[PDB]
Amino acid sequence: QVQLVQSGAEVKKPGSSVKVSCKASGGTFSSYAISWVRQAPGQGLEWMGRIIPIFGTANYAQKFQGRVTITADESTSTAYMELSSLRSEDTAVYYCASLASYSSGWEDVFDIWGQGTMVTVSSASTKGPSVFPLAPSSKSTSGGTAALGCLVKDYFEPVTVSWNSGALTSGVHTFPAVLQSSGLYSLSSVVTVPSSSLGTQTYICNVNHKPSNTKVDKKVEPKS
Amino acid sequence: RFASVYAWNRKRISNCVADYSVLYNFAPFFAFKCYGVSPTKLNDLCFTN
Amino acid sequence: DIQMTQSSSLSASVGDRVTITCRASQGISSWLAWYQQKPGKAPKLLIYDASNLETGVPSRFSGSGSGTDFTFTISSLQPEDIATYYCQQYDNLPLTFGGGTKVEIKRTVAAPSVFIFPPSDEQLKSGTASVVCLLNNFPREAKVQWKVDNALQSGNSQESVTEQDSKDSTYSLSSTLTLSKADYEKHKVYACEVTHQGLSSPVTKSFNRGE
C-alpha cells in the first residue's frame, strides 16, 4: 500500500525561489520513485522532472532545466523541488506522483497521486477582502424571482461567499478567480430568490477569508 | 596531493597483493562503486597490473 | 519533439457511446495512457496499457489503437463521468500530456434567467460604479454588451462563466461592469443587453441617474 501527501499552498514574489516537497509515505523509500508534473491554469499536465531516491538518477524537461532543480533523501523520505527565478507565469499547481517505470517491468505511468501544491505569484500580500452588497430596484422583479448580489474585491486565495449564513444554495452563481491590474483578486456571488420575498423576508450575505482569518457580513437593501 | 583534475596523479601498482577487504574499505572512505565487477568479487578476481 | 493533440469538448447523455483520439506526429510504440480528472484536481489513472485496464476501474471504460494513433472510449456514459480526460505519451523521457478532452453530462437546453441590479451607495460613495448582468441555468456560449446613453459600447465589463451544473447540466454567466463615478453620472441611462445562444432578442434592462 502506497499513498502520498504534498505540502501546503505557497505565495512569493517574482524572480525569487520557491521550495516544495512531497512525503514518500507508504511502502519504502527504496521501492519508491517520485516525479513532479506541472498543471497550469488553462493548460493540461506538464512534466517537470523525475527522481529515484534510491538510484539517485534525475532529469528535467527541455524547458525547465536550471529554472527547476530536483533533490531527494531517505532521512526524510521525500522528493525536494526548487524553482528559481520564477516568472509571474509560474502561477500554477504542482503535483508529485509515483513513477511506476522504476521496477519490475512496469511503465512510465503514475498509479498514485498526491493532493497538489498551489504556487501563486503576484505583487500583493495576504490581506482581507473588501465586501459590499447590491441594491436592486423594485421594478427589477420578473416572473416571481429577484436577484440578490454580494461582491468581493481587493482580496488575496479562497473567499467563501454564502447567503443566509449558508442556508441558501439554490441558484448560486459564482465567479472564478479573476485578478485585477493591481495584483489583487475578486469574487462575487449572486443568487435568485422569490421576488415577493424581496423587502418582506430578510436576507443577508456573508464572506470569509481563511488566510487572513476574517469575516464580513452585510445586509442587502433595495432602493428607488 | 592530487588537488586538481588536471595534471592528475597516477600510479602503476604491480608485483604485489591487494587486500581490498581492508584497503580502500576503511572508515574515512565514504563512497565506493564499481563497473563491470562487484566489489565482493573484485576481492577475489585479480589481474596483471 | 514528440507532441499530441486530443480531439476538445464533448457532451453526451447517460447510455450512449463516446470516442476520443489523441493524434501524434510519430508512431508511439503503444506507450500511451489515459487519466480521469476533475478540472484542477489530482487525476486518476484508468488506462496505462493500450489494452489493459488497471485495478479498480470498471470495464465500462475502454480504449483501442496502436502505433501513431489511439482511441479512448466509454461504452456507456453515466453521471459519474462529469470530468476531463487526458491522453498521455510515455514513449520517451521528455514526458508530455494532452490538452484534455472534457465530456459534460447532457441535459437538453433551457432558457436563461436574465437579471440586473445597479450599484449601491456603498459602491457609489467610493468614487466608482458597477452593474452586474446575469444569466442563470442555460450550452455555455453567451455575450453581454452595454448601451449607456443609447449608444453602443463594449470592452468595459468582466465576463465569467460558471462550471457545469450537475443538477441540470446548465451553466451560469455572471458579469459585472466597473467604471468611475464620473462615468456613472455622465450618461443619462445605463443599460445591459444580453445575448445568448437561446434568447428572443437582446434583453434590455436599464436605469437612470436617481434610480
Next chain:
Amino acid sequence: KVGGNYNYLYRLFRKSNLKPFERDISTEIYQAGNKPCNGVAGFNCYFPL
C-alpha cells in the same frame, strides 16, 4: 529511452548462486557482515538491483 527505461533491472550480487530455474522476487538488501545493516549502507549493503 534517452536517459530512461528504468523498469528493466538485474541483480548484481546475491548471498549465493541461484539454482536452475529459480526466481527471487524479494529485493532485500544484501548483508555485509562486518557491520549491522537495517537501512541503506555502503560497500556490501547496496540495493542489489
